Amino acid sequence: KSPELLARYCDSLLKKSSKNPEEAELEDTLNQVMVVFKYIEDKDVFQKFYAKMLAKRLVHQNSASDDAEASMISKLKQACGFEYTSKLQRMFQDIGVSKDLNEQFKKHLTNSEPLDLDFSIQVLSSGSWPFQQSCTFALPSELERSYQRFTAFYASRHSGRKLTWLYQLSKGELVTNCFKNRYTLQASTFQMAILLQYNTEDAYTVQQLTDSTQIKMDILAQVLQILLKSKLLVLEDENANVDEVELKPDTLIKLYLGYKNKKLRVNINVPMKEDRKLLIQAAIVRIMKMRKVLKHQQLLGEVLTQLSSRFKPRVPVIKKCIDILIEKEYLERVDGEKDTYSYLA
Amino acid sequence: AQKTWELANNMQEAQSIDEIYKYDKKQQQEILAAKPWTKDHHYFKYCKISALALLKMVMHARSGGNLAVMGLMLGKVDGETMIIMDSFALPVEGTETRVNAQAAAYEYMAAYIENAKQVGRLENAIGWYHSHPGYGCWLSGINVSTQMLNQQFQEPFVA
């Protein structure tokens, strides 16, 4: 838990607050973090919660001092090694690549028929990010044309690549033309679709919104709850407490025409929220007895052949098993070759 | 063939081929009392395994399949040669790379040797054998350790 706490410290440090630490003192406190970092005996676990914390920091563009992010990973790379910071290097490079990609896309737009909205997208990458497409969603009629346009731009530039859009992590801004004044709210894609459904009629039932947006039940219920919290959708019984109201697919929710919030920058997009090791050791010692002298890669391949057919173990676990078996003086390294083991019983 | 081959075979008397099958107790006592292997260390250089002992050891080794098996071998010594006249299995249970002989082998050894002495087996245990199913014929670290242990106290012993 202490590693997690240190990593959350890191998160604050780099993320973003009302006060931005100067670049001089920002690296000063980062050096102190690395002073205690080497004292940490176990290094594998630190990368586990640092990956998801960093991914949320960058995908939402909530990171502060992205230059300090490059130096932070630079310090880590020389500390533990390339393999320990290989995944995080992909995350940073994807942000830099997509930032360049956005600039070229804007230039391509001017030379052709322009869009009707300011469109920006982070392309990310598959296999290196914890994100995955988990919620089905129907693309709104207003956010389709631009969609197609970008796909074309991503087909002429890159061939053989397929995009898998993540509407769960996509935000946006929506203007209004029917309120008392001109408002500009910020909401996720789900909330944008729900609020744009009311463009042609006044009141809809819950089922009429579920079958129009194809969002799953739990996420749709949560989005309706937060929208009701922002008093943007008004139920028939005003006096009923919103938290204890039980939602059913029969209530006729209508758009609140008389919305009169004083602030013109309403942000309703606020975020929410052992046994195997012995088996690997036995396989390693058996393979070492069968083959007296082996290389690290050949030993890994043999372990994968004999044992990975059962539960598909992770390579770092096997490497740690090799290290602990070395400490137990079960197999020794051979001088003259960095990766060579001899079964010394 | 007459006189030429009459005494050339002489089935009544053991031939020069069957000479090794005769156990000389006095010579064995003399050689074990002299202990000529204590002065030198590359003393024994030849190991003469009988046909029956080799056949029994091979069949036992194959019977285990991919699991290791082990047993003892009776015999004697003569000059620089270790002669193995027989072999006998042990009731052990082992895995593909480890055989231990925990508690049933040690009673079986003594009881089998006592039973064999009753029906005219004058040879004593000369060695121990075990199988390496699929990784050559060599001595591992624990094999070397147990070979040292056997050799240091029971002086004539070959693995």
Swiss-Prot record, chain A:
There is a cross-link at residue 289 (Glycyl lysine isopeptide (Lys-Gly) (interchain with G-Cter in NEDD8)). Neddylated; which enhances the ubiquitination activity of SCF. Neddylation prevents binding of the inhibitor CAND1. Neddylation leads to structural rearrangment in the complex that allows interaction between the E2 ubiquitin-conjugating enzyme and the acceptor ubiquitin. Deneddylated via its interaction with the COP9 signalosome (CSN) complex. Signal peptide: none annotated. Residues 275-335 form the Cullin neddylation domain. Expressed in lung fibroblasts. Component of multiple Cul1-RING E3 ubiquitin-protein ligase complexes commonly known as SCF (SKP1-CUL1-F-box) complexes, consisting of CUL1, SKP1, RBX1 and a variable F-box domain-containing protein as substrate-specific subunit. Component of the SCF(FBXW11) complex containing FBXW11. Component of the SCF(SKP2) complex containing SKP2, in which it interacts directly with SKP1, SKP2 and RBX1. Component of the SCF(FBXW2) complex containing FBXW2. Component of the SCF(FBXO32) complex containing FBXO32. Component of the probable SCF(FBXO7) complex containing FBXO7. (Microbial infection) Interacts with Epstein-Barr virus BPLF1. The Cullin neddylation domain restrains the RING domain of RBX1 in the E3 ubiquitin-protein ligase complex; this restraint is removed upon neddylation of the cullin. Core component of multiple cullin-RING-based SCF (SKP1-CUL1-F-box protein) E3 ubiquitin-protein ligase complexes, which mediate the ubiquitination of proteins involved in cell cycle progression, signal transduction and transcription. SCF complexes and ARIH1 collaborate in tandem to mediate ubiquitination of target proteins. In the SCF complex, serves as a rigid scaffold that organizes the SKP1-F-box protein and RBX1 subunits. May contribute to catalysis through positioning of the substrate and the ubiquitin-conjugating enzyme. Belongs to the cullin family. This is Cullin-1. The gene is CUL1.
UniProtKB/Swiss-Prot annotation, chain B:
Transmembrane segments: none annotated. It is found in: Cytoplasm, Cytosol; Nucleus; Cytoplasm, Perinuclear region; Cytoplasmic vesicle, Secretory vesicle, Synaptic vesicle. Residues 47-159 form the MPN domain. A motif (JAMM motif) lies at residues 130-143. Zn(2+) binds at residues 130, 132, 143. The CSN complex is associated with some 'Lys-63'-specific deubiquitination. Such activity is however not mediated by the core CSN complex but by the BRCC3/BRCC36 component of the BRISC complex. Probable protease subunit of the COP9 signalosome complex (CSN), a complex involved in various cellular and developmental processes. The CSN complex is an essential regulator of the ubiquitin (Ubl) conjugation pathway by mediating the deneddylation of the cullin subunits of the SCF-type E3 ligase complexes, leading to decrease the Ubl ligase activity of SCF-type complexes such as SCF, CSA or DDB2. The complex is also involved in phosphorylation of p53/TP53, c-jun/JUN, IkappaBalpha/NFKBIA, ITPK1 and IRF8, possibly via its association with CK2 and PKD kinases. Belongs to the peptidase M67A family. CSN5 subfamily. Component of the CSN complex, composed of COPS1/GPS1, COPS2, COPS3, COPS4, COPS5, COPS6, COPS7 (COPS7A or COPS7B), COPS8 and COPS9 isoform 1. In the complex, it probably interacts directly with COPS1, COPS2, COPS4, COPS6 and COPS7 (COPS7A or COPS7B) and COPS9 isoform 1. Interacts with COPS9 isoform 2. The CSN complex interacts with the BRISC complex. Also exists as monomeric form. Interacts with TP53, MIF, JUN, UCHL1, NCOA1, HIF1A, CDKN1B, BCL3, GFER, PGR, LHCGR, SMAD4, SMAD7, ID1, ID3, ITGB2 and TOP2A. Part of a complex consisting of RANBP9, Ran, DYRK1B and COPS5. Interacts with IFIT3. The JAMM motif is essential for the protease activity of the CSN complex resulting in deneddylation of cullins. It constitutes the catalytic center of the complex. This is COP9 signalosome complex subunit 5. It comes from Homo sapiens. The gene is COPS5. The chain holds residues 9 to 167 of 334 of the full protein.
